[model samples]
Target: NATQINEELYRLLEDTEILNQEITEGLLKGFEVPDAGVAIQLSKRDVVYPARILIIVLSEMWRFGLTKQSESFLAQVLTTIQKVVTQLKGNDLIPSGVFWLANVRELYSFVVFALNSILTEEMTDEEYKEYVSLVTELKDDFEALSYNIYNIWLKKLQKQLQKKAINAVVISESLPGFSEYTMDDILTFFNSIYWCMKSFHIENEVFHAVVTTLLNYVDAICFNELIMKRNFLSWKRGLQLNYNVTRLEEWCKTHGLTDGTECLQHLIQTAKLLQVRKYTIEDIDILRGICYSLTPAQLQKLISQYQVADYESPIPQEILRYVADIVKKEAALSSIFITPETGPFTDPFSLIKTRKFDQVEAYIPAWLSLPSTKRIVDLVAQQV
Candidate 1:
């Protein structure tokens, strides 16, 4: 009985080769073009329209009784997306790459939304299980696609951050009779990335991952440098180091970058250890509490190498041995497995749990300059 109704819907989605072609061309033409020697930025609407249209078309057919043809239609759209991504792969164009990443996420979101909307009590249990499995397969494909794009983009940003962070976080000393050291270089670099993600309309979770990963790298470099560069472990340098750490923390707070500040824990504690009064026995407990993230070996090295300023008192032998005692206890309790290598930062995309929207509108707004997209609009209208 349902087969008769399904025939029309199946035939409608059967020949999707032209539809795939249109989507690929529209996406590339909009995202891949450079304007006046500068790469053009992608808007959220432009990137999302293709996915919206595809999902809507699928919805229309499913509402009429589309069942088996769903997989083939989805495969065509994915192939189109893959072709677009491969075409743009070698350009090193970040905005375009983010465009595809966002689009895939949009598809993943709407597909789930559509699946929920179409589920009914009338369908048999076997039909429900099969349909859910089909969607699960497509969801994994989109997740994998977004994962690759997110990783490549982060790797590029980290490479750029690596060169600037050494000066911004490590070199705390300034010239004689000159201004104090500033985090302007690294902060400005971060500002640029923030603007890039915003302009491309990158999702909030993805942005959080990017910011957190970069901070982790900053933490790695600053912590390693503090241990490796003995000259930098002075009371005055500690004051400057705390100032730098505060600036970064302040920046993350200003941007409302959640889960990002925790990455700087080790650096923050290290800076405090340098500035805290360490000559008295009473100071050991304070230092111990403040430097919780630091290992015993790291704490011992930093304490042993501390450069007392001209007017400052040196750490007393009693305090030094007291710290040594604490180190021994800490070492015995914990395994020494901490590595301070500047990161080959892990991809944060895999860890993200995607947000679920309560409503996904199928309407396509104004068809901007992407020529082939207008045809998709007209075609969707024709189906009605």
Candidate 2:
């Protein structure tokens, strides 16, 4: 039985070369999603093939009363799979990172399905408990790897955002020296990312997480600049800022994102600060009620630096003093800063308890250049 297990293990070890080859090809060549009425599939394959065969072999081992051997080979195969995914890093341009994530997630799902199939009434509850214990660490490794891949992709995009987010998201037509970045530029940027991820068939969970984190970054940079710059504190700038943020909200809706739009509230409220009447004492209450996202300190800073347009009247000095008094008195009521909740977010894919293996079968895409593992392919196909 050890000989049989080790033989299968050797075969799988050899298969890692195929995995690496396929992933590397995806990295170097790029994904090609077919169009013009053709059915779509993942652009790469072979990575999931080893895991599928391993799970089927594992189930056979369980039936042969080689549970310990099954567990050992399972760990070895998963370790190698993780190594292949972790060792070869790729840039964001081709989204190979997302491809690996998709495979690892599928790998974990396959193992889960195989284990579930073995839990018939013939096996005792204690036996089932031992069965489930074997792949627990493998499941966790896949989850952590998924998170790492996502973070790597997001951090790269965030770096790109530093150059354009402030200018693009808060286009200031009234300010002469500000950069020419417009709301359309920002929309195009988001679209490029969406298209790249979509081409790789990224899951909705990953997309939502990426969208939330990126929106938070935009909110932080744009809002910080609004408070820091005196020239940007005019009614005309506010009107343009509000219009720019509205465009982002529309973009989110177009992408079917509902919760991510909430992260832009601080920027929206700050825009209102620029356009609203600040001349009367009564206006202070209206501002306090409307701009709840801004702390008293932030409000005080923006109002103190408030610039009057050439055609507009400025706030009375007494009103500024009144706001100062309110800010000083209510300083402890709200924290001075609002930090963005960028994450290590909850693993969005963890919501599912388990799934039937066949319900989520993976197909070898036509684009794969590697030789077919027909023995495994035919075997897997017969089950469906």
In angstroms, the error of model 2 at 355 is: 4.5
Model 2 Cα displacement at 130 (Å)?
Answer: 8.3
For each candidate in turn, the TM-score is 0.68, 0.72
Range of the 10 consecutive residues with the lowest summed lDDT in candidate 1: 29-38
With a 3 Å backbone cut-off (N, CA, C), the pairs that clash in candidate 2 are none
lDDT of 1 at 260: 56
Q: Give the clashing residue pairs of candidate 1, or none.
A: none
Q: What's the CA error at residue 335 for candidate 1, in Å?
A: 7.7
lDDT of 1 by residue, 1-384 (tens): 445434544455554565445544554344442221125475555556656666666665455445555566666666666665655532254555566676677777766555565454326778777777776677787766666556656666666556667677767443323222348877776665565566656666667767787788778866877777666587777777778888888889877686556889888888899888887777877787778788777878889889877777878888789878877886688523345434444545446555465544445655445433454345555554
Give stretches of model 2 more than 4 Å off.
1-97, 121-133, 171-181, 192-206, 332-336, 353-355, 359-384
Model 1 segments more than 4 A misplaced: 1-22, 25-47, 53-98, 121-136, 172-182, 192-210, 257-261, 309-319, 332-373, 382-384
CA RMSD, predictions in order: 6.4, 5.8
- In angstroms, how far off is 232's CA in candidate 1? 2.6
Q: Residue-wise lDDT of candidate 2 within 1-384, one digit each (tens)?
A: 556545544454345445334433432233332321124344434434444444554554555556765555555554554454444432333244455555566766766665455444336778767766765655676666656655655565676676677777665453455426677767877776565557555567677877778898889877876777866577777877877888888889888689655879888898899889998988988999999878777889889898886667868899999989988898556544556555656655566453346643534445445442333333444545
